Design a protein around this ligand. Structure first.
Ligand SMILES: *[C@@H]1O[C@H](CO)[C@@H](O[C@@H]2O[C@H](CO)[C@@H](O[C@@H]3O[C@H](CO)[C@@H](O)[C@H](O[C@H]4O[C@H](CO)[C@@H](O)[C@H](O)[C@@H]4O)[C@@H]3O)[C@H](O)[C@H]2NC(C)=O)[C@H](O)[C@H]1NC(C)=O
Ligand SMILES: *[C@@H]1O[C@H](CO)[C@@H](O[C@@H]2O[C@H](CO)[C@@H](O[C@@H]3O[C@H](CO)[C@@H](O)[C@H](O[C@H]4O[C@H](CO)[C@@H](O)[C@H](O)[C@@H]4O)[C@@H]3O)[C@H](O)[C@H]2NC(C)=O)[C@H](O)[C@H]1NC(C)=O
Ligand SMILES: *[C@@H]1O[C@H](CO)[C@@H](O[C@@H]2O[C@H](CO)[C@@H](O[C@@H]3O[C@H](CO)[C@@H](O)[C@H](O[C@H]4O[C@H](CO)[C@@H](O)[C@H](O)[C@@H]4O)[C@@H]3O)[C@H](O)[C@H]2NC(C)=O)[C@H](O)[C@H]1NC(C)=O
Ligand SMILES: *[C@@H]1O[C@H](CO)[C@@H](O)[C@H](O)[C@H]1NC(C)=O
Ligand SMILES: *[C@@H]1O[C@H](CO)[C@@H](O)[C@H](O)[C@H]1NC(C)=O
Ligand SMILES: *[C@@H]1O[C@H](CO)[C@@H](O)[C@H](O)[C@H]1NC(C)=O
Ligand SMILES: *[C@@H]1O[C@H](CO)[C@@H](O)[C@H](O)[C@H]1NC(C)=O
Ligand SMILES: *[C@@H]1O[C@H](CO)[C@@H](O)[C@H](O)[C@H]1NC(C)=O
Ligand SMILES: *[C@@H]1O[C@H](CO)[C@@H](O)[C@H](O)[C@H]1NC(C)=O
Ligand SMILES: OC[C@H]1O[C@H](O)[C@@H](O)[C@@H](O)[C@@H]1O
Ligand SMILES: OC[C@H]1O[C@H](O)[C@@H](O)[C@@H](O)[C@@H]1O
Ligand SMILES: OC[C@H]1O[C@H](O)[C@@H](O)[C@@H](O)[C@@H]1O
Lengths: 436, 436, 436
């Protein structure tokens, strides 16, 4: 239960042992915010194991004004680490320093008890560093130290998982427009949530297969790919002028593949910047609902296109697409979640969501899974901007000769709107170009 | 308990019965957000009434990957509708389709029970449409359908009612200024609240009558109208230079009448745009506290002036004004509310309000009447703008030759401030004109 | 339990007793928001002491439409004031008027009981004014009055106290930058909190003393002042190029002294404007981390410099600094708070704070000490701007010949950024000058 950090521990005196040394800071007993604790150390005579209370041996630390905090050197073993910190904190100790009797610097080894009151930092030091202090304290030399935990303490091992089911269609009416306005408004929140490790978002899509009585029929050719293995209704429903379901299944699988690629590289928030820019740059009315326009966004955001077209695979082949198969399989009820039948469905913590699609409504439902003192900044009724403008200018237009870019980070996420220079509203096509 | 919607139901196959048909979607079991559910239908052999559990007859629906959802055709009668949906949802059904044995398409007919877990959509179809499916399922033809509830589910039948008591005076000190800053700041919130059906606001005003010992005295002539039937103190209290109480009673009755007219047409939020623009365009210091200036706002906002001057009636006649009589009557304690004596008094859900006049304080008090999963967007710590700019340009100045208007929708509501074009701050009188 | 206010009470009739008179409005029974209550008075025959229920003597006040509210004249004594208001409110009275039988106008004299339902205003009037009404009611003359409590009811006697421990160093890494971004972001919230009397903030700083074995050593000369009585580690830790701990102890003591001076004059929020402008105008990289640059901020904000340099005293003398002694003493555990060892430590209501340093996180922790219906505007999820721009232009640059200033009040507090005029972004050194 100790995370190893090298630059955290530093010794100021004695000068013979001065320097930076590695230590394994504890997960509990330290504050979330980063900081610094400077103090001296004391090695007790009795109860060096800290397995019993220090009041029995009449050992107190008695912090006084102007005095350096009293770090305690504890011999590892005979009792749990959390109990050692509790005994020292009762005596008034500022922090504990456990020296493992084992020589391995990497070894780092419970039940929910009354340990939340522990507020003193804990650390595990190498046996070499521990015995170096024991010798300095026996010679009459003070050992003054500095401890910089510094880490904001992410603790994102168990967070909130939300899965959204959407469609890339934009002409089906107000239902499709409500989702786009939601994705554009929720992008800024979801990005900072995933960047802070507070959320794990997985976008999902819905496809069906051609029935056996309709196999090779004309309706199965217009709405389905991979020989009728993955389907979707026609957007316009006119068919003669509509884009047909195939183009929808392709762009859905493309957006799913953009997530499959970015999730492996460690940037799933890029999926949000892709689907929002997809609705802005590649519409169906302008006939820009093509693969060429979609690949332009993939290139503008630095997304790897080879990994995407490989994830997509053959659009027309009797083989099965692994992502669309995993998506149709993801629709089946996996325990308490139940089956996913509705098209705009959101599932938070493996239980579905029926409230309104408002951003604040979705947020208020997600902040219920978080515990107190761990709620993110966004959850605590605080509004913040994104930070995508700093890399590749967010994939927005830019003129370095004038220190002027089309990128702008907002609460809705990065937006590549043409900038206004000297009062002149530049009119251009967002990132592709901008001109007065 | 079913709302009738025509375009919601559509049949894709068989082609002999394809088309859009009317259906009565259920109030419960459907999500608030709008969406689409595409699936096929199944007519059970036993328990067609859905009055008993399907596990007794060993009937399950067994949803599988890639399979269309399983709509169920239930014969109406012998049990309640909510119990039919509960039995099907246990078997894994996606939605139920009740076919009324009665031939009337309009007939649509409990106690609070464990029905909140019902999350499958419910619908009532005509007996013609129901028997058309029974014949298609007996011939061996699949019936694939699409159901678009789509409605955001307003459910505004029982909402929050708040009544505010104000005065149009603007020179009585800081007390009158605190109300105007409140009305200007709360306008944007109250408008979106009433537009979404979440609130019913009624503005109220306070008037007294001349005592019998003071009848026809000079003080009763300055402060009272309708031969001393409705009164108000002098604003300035100097009388010689003050506007006298009569002008206050007239403008109060005028603002009340603006609400009486707009409430009948279905736009009570216009009262907010009127009283805020009244404090901006018709002040007492500029001597614009006249009927002419007030009628200009009535014309700018498209308010019907005939219905207002009829509601006002004769300002000086021994007859009684019905609105001011209903207002003086509205002051009397009608149950738990008690009498309304304080001038800036707010009553929410027929119980008064003592907290501070801050917008967030008034909001937090109103969001207590709303239930969870039904709180409006404004209540859920989300800040949004209004939408009055789209009609008549909100009654603000506009130059179509430059695509430039003086209207601006904000969180405080529509505001007719002069726009800034090309860096040049146009200086003008708001809506009346604007010029660089 | 009555606050004396002169202009609150005014009499309209009879004309022989008309005028403004002093009265002692009650702390309870009145609303927080300011307003006005106009009504007539009634002196009961029996139970003039209001010590028994009015239903026994069959005395009711019976408010009717158009009728003036019924103020009650109660003789002081024989029972508590709160019980008198409760008896009158049951009879339907609008407000009570207690006339002290004692002739002193200043005398104004419990356990938590069921008195929260009391919503009628209460007031204590002089015996002269009380007997003047008794004579007017015996002669058959109506006494019409007006009562303007008006006060927002601050009640800031017992509020939230938060103490923050910071350091003026800006090159120690990200730990020092996290604090500055926090102080810049929290400045706007903390200022409005202290201005409304809702918070008492005391900034604190951490210093140590030179050990006896290190007295007069070179390391004690670089990090410590007053002959090694107050210390701090070197910022850069290089010493050869670092500013040395002495400069840090001096600027910390200077910032503490700026608070010690401003707290006595009644403007502790100026400390926030000082430390934020200190990080903007006097950095260490530009070598502006000098006393001269720091005194410029003291002069720009109108802070009294004599009281600051006196609080600082002799930077190098064997005497002890009273503020730094009170600061080192403030570090010791004073009850439930415990010792303060961590450098960025915040203590709210004498109990420490472990959550993240986010503004919303700190706010949510502070709003827990406030009771309901008394939470400030900032606490109730409402965002507001400051009001420092109105005095000395917030100590920002200004050009009166163009109505253009560099001051701007925001949610982060006053900021002296160069203004943009006619689209031209003026580039200057904030307040010191600004030019296109
Ligand atoms: C996006 O990429 C992330 C990369 O982190 C990925 O998250 C990872 O998912 C895997 C698979 O779900 C998680 O591994 C699971 O972790 C726990 C803890 O051990 C176990 O419950 C799981 O065991 C399963 O797999 C075992 C295989 O040995 C089986 O024996 C067992 O029966 C279970 O089936 C499983 O190991 C992993 O913890 C996360 N990691 C993080 C950091 O979240 C995510 O799934 C990717 N998403 C998509 C949509 O591709
Ligand atoms: C602004 O206009 C709206 C228009 O909707 C208006 O709201 C309506 O007010 C009326 C009158 O208060 C409401 O009707 C009431 O509804 C319930 C349900 O039936 C009943 O409690 C009431 O019965 C009363 O009236 C009966 C007359 O037959 C009496 O027999 C009975 O004893 C009661 O006195 C009454 O019918 C109506 O429901 C609302 N409608 C909506 C949609 O809110 C509002 O009052 C107008 N406001 C102003 C200030 O003019
Ligand atoms: C900033 O200036 C403000 C000015 O208001 C100042 O707040 C005041 O602090 C003093 C000292 O802490 C408070 O006085 C205390 O009040 C209560 C109520 O009576 C008592 O608990 C305290 O008694 C102490 O002092 C007595 C001296 O006679 C002793 O007999 C007793 O044992 C206690 O030690 C004490 O009187 C005062 O109430 C506040 N006032 C306000 C309005 O807050 C604040 O301390 C200054 N801060 C700094 C950092 O300089
Ligand atoms: C310990 O933390 C718990 C949290 O449940 C709290 O109730 C308790 O008062 C704390 N006790 C001490 C001594 O800090
Ligand atoms: C361009 O703008 C960036 C972003 O602030 C800034 O760091 C950089 O110095 C600027 N370059 C110029 C003004 O030449
Ligand atoms: C049904 O809803 C209630 C709401 O009170 C909830 O407590 C319960 O867990 C739900 N049960 C199921 C099976 O969904
Ligand atoms: C005027 O502005 C409106 C509002 O955006 C826009 O719809 C319209 O096309 C504009 N007309 C022009 C630029 O001629
Ligand atoms: C009095 O106030 C209390 C607050 O605890 C409330 O519960 C109660 O209903 C109120 N009673 C009346 C009669 O207003
Ligand atoms: C300067 O600006 C102030 C702040 O609004 C204003 O009160 C004043 O009238 C202005 N003076 C001018 C425009 O001469
Ligand atoms: O403990 C549950 C689970 O957590 C994570 C990993 O440490 C896994 O090895 C382990 O099985
Ligand atoms: O049910 C209460 C009330 O609700 C509404 C209307 O449907 C009325 O007819 C009915 O009386
Ligand atoms: O009552 C506690 C305390 O409150 C304050 C002052 O009124 C003090 O005189 C008093 O001792």
């Amino acid at each position: 239960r100790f995370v190893v950090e090298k630059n955290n521990l530093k010794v100021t005196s004695p000068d013979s042992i001065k320097g930076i040394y590695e230590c394994a800071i504890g997960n509990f007993g330290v504050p979330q915010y980063g900081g610094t604790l400077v103090g001296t150390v004391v090695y007790p005579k009795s109860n060096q194991k800290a397995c019993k209370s220090y009041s029995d041996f009449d050992i107190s630390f008695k912090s006084k004004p102007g005095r350096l905090p009293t770090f305690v050197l504890i011999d590892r073993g005979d009792c749990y680490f959390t109990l050692k910190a509790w005994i020292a904190q009762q005596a008034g100790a500022a922090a504990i320093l456990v020296a493992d009797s084992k020589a391995e610097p990497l070894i780092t080894m419970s039940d929910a008890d009354y340990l939340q009151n522990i507020t003193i930092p804990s650390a595990l030091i190498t046996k070499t560093l521990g015995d170096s202090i024991k010798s300095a304290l026996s010679g009459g030399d003070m050992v003054n130290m500095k401890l910089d935990w510094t880490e904001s303490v992410p603790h994102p091992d168990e967070r909130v998982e939300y899965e959204l089911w959407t469609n890339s269609n934009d002409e089906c009416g107000k239902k499709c427009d409500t989702q786009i306005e939601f994705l554009k408004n929720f992008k800024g929140a979801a990005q900072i949530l995933e960047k802070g490790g507070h959320t794990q978002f997985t976008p999902h899509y819905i496809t069906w297969y051609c029935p056996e009585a309709f196999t090779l029929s004309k309706q199965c050719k217009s709405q389905c790919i991979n020989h009728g293995r993955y389907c979707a209704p026609d957007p316009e429903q006119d068919f003669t002028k509509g884009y047909d379901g195939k183009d929808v299944v392709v762009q859905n699988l493309r957006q799913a593949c953009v997530y499959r690629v970015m999730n492996d590289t460690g940037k799933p928030w890029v999926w949000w910047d892709y689907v929002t820019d997809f609705a802005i740059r590649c519409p169906m009315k302008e006939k820009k609902y093509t693969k060429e326009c979609a690949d332009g966004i993939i290139k503008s955001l630095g997304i790897d296109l080879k990994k995407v077209d490989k994830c997509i695979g053959d659009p027309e082949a009797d083989v099965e697409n692994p992502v669309l198969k995993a998506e149709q399989e993801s629709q089946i009820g996996k325990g308490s979640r139940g089956d996913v039948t509705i098209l705009p469905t959101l599932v938070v913590n493996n239980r579905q969501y029926r409230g309104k699609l408002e951003k604040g409504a979705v947020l208020k439902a997600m902040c219920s899974g978080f515990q107190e003192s761990t709620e993110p900044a966004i959850c605590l009724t605080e509004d913040l901007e994104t930070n995508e403008c700093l890399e590749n200018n967010g994939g927005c237009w830019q003129d370095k000769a004038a220190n002027i870019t089309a990128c702008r980070d907002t609460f809705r996420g990065r937006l590549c709107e043409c900038p206004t220079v000297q009062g002149v509203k530049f009119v251009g096509d967002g990132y592709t170009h901008c001109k007065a």
